[PDB]
Design a protein around this ligand. Structure first.
Ligand SMILES: O=C(Cc1cccc(Cl)c1)Nc1nnc2ccccn12
Ligand SMILES: O=C(Cc1cccc(Cl)c1)Nc1nnc2ccccn12
Lengths: 304, 304
């Protein structure tokens, strides 16, 4: 029992973190096989970030200008290329700690763990989600760029995020491992505002199922609703529309608890309309949306 | 910017997790040097847990009855001993992945990371605190016993907790690595209720400082208070008494923000008396008490 915002064990990813320096900029790189991935803005000076032409800036850079250090030992760079907003630095040595891995591009609402790093060294691990506005609510300081987001399935690490930027509102933007940003963000020091940060409805419902499994049941009511009626309420409260696909994904949690998905929707509808009334659910005084249905099942079953 | 419930990177501890089986019970062990530490209740059957005499039960056990598996390879047990509520299994091989380490006994209010494990395999990592009633609010299922709690200082892992038990209220109890339980709990299936779970005042104030550093400032008011006046309010709300030692530990956060500790106490006093009024602080609708002043400084400075 008990329900926590749990991250994946980070060891497999710690073994991949390296430091990359170009000129006077130092950030993090991810070393998998004989390639080191890092944000392309490592080639930029402070003045370059306002309006950078990355292709032009990269012409002035050679393999020997990219300093890559793995722990206390230097890696030899034998090639470099730009793929979208990331640089791929080919080194002469395969990372002996390379886990089984995949590069995945996640959808909004999906969660992942972040290993925050500075100077190629891990500082901490936390769980977060790709918001519906394509930002992440992370905890990153200067030097954290190149820190990665990932999920693990037994022995395979699926890398889904690389940190690039902090918006003026304190929210974070980054790319997948192919260097494509999530959302409309660009790697430039320019006016980039985030859209509406709506609540991930399917995740809230999964977390309400987690609460029932753990004994917090005060919010269960005698009501039911329909997808259309629920969705009218969800629109009013800036919650994402619930689809039949979301209902289907909640099937195993509905089966485990015996609470029909639409009945849980009616409980969520009353919580939105009436508030918590000073009460808590799973130690939270607000409705938590950064646990997916898969996360709830995984945590409640003990998948290693 | 951004503030998250962040755990230490878990790799150094993942390299120490092993599976221990005695009879039909399987739980986790911690392998450091040539010793494997695990809860002594691994020797108990389901019927033994009601009123176990551990010394008597242990007489019927020999080295070959403790099966220790590190990954897929079996460790040879060449000695066994009971130290308080833990068993120390001497194996013939030093763990080649043993990090620099210490065993520490923490005080209530102190935080640590937990690497939840099943069958010697890591499932997840989360941050928690030793509650003032000596329980922890973890996320543990059957098979999680022997999972450990730890803090890391650069390269040294300080182990502070080993999971032993879940109370009937869904809260968790365990020992330090010398096998002494935190609080009055015993490793028996018996009536053990937890005391008042008071709020860790010094941690709430540290988290209010973290909020100011990250831009959440709505709760700052025009008031001040004294330690004695504040403590009258803290008693009323089941908050721990704030001492001058706590004020001193908050000094660096007071210096960074320019907000005197007693002024922050007055802000906390108004939050206790008036509530949040439907507002949030650092994405929370309640006052968070599982970040110590050291955690706030560490996260806000990027210590690796
Ligand atoms: O935002 C930047 C630098 C940058 C500026 C403009 C565009 C790009 Cl791609 C990168 N670095 C960064 N990332 N997280 C944090 C957190 C705190 C301070 C700086 N942070
Ligand atoms: O509580 C026990 C077994 C036990 C019973 C009585 C005394 C002792 Cl020392 C140990 N195991 C356990 N620990 N965390 C969880 C979580 C879910 C189920 C069981 N859990």
């Amino acid at each position: 029992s008990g329900f926590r915002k749990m991250a994946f064990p980070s060891g497999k990813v710690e073994g991949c973190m390296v430091q990359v320096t170009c000129g006077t900029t130092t950030l993090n790189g991810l070393w998998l096989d004989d390639v080191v991935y890092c944000p392309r803005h490592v080639i930029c000076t402070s003045e370059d970030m306002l309006n950078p032409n990355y292709e032009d800036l990269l012409i002035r850079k050679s393999n020997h200008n990219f300093l890559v250090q793995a722990g206390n030992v230097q890696l030899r760079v034998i090639g470099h290329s730009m793929q979208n907003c990331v640089l791929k630095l080919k080194v002469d040595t395969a990372n002996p700690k390379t886990p089984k891995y995949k590069f995945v591009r996640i959808q909004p609402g999906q969660t992942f763990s972040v290993l925050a790093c500075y100077n190629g060294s891990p500082s901490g691990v936390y769980q977060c989600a790709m918001r519906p506005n394509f930002t992440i609510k992370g905890s990153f300081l200067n030097g954290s760029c190149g820190s990665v987001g990932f999920n693990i399935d037994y022995d395979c690490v699926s890398f889904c995020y690389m940190h690039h930027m902090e918006l003026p509102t304190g929210v974070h933007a980054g790319t997948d491992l192919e260097g494509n940003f999530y959302g409309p963000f660009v790697d430039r020091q320019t006016a980039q505002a985030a859209g509406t940060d709506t609540t991930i409805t399917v995740n809230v419902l999964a977390w309400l199922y987690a609460a029932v499994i753990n004994g917090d049941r005060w919010f269960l009511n005698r009501f039911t609703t329909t997808l259309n009626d629920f969705n009218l309420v969800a629109m009013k409260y800036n919650y994402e529309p619930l689809t039949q696909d979301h209902v289907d994904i909640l099937g195993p949690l509905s089966a485990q608890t015996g609470i029909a998905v639409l009945d849980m929707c009616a409980s969520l509808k009353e919580l939105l309309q009436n508030g918590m009334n000073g009460r808590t659910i799973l130690g939270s005084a607000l409705l938590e949306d950064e646990f997916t249905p898969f996360d709830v099942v995984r945590q409640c079953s003990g998948v290693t």
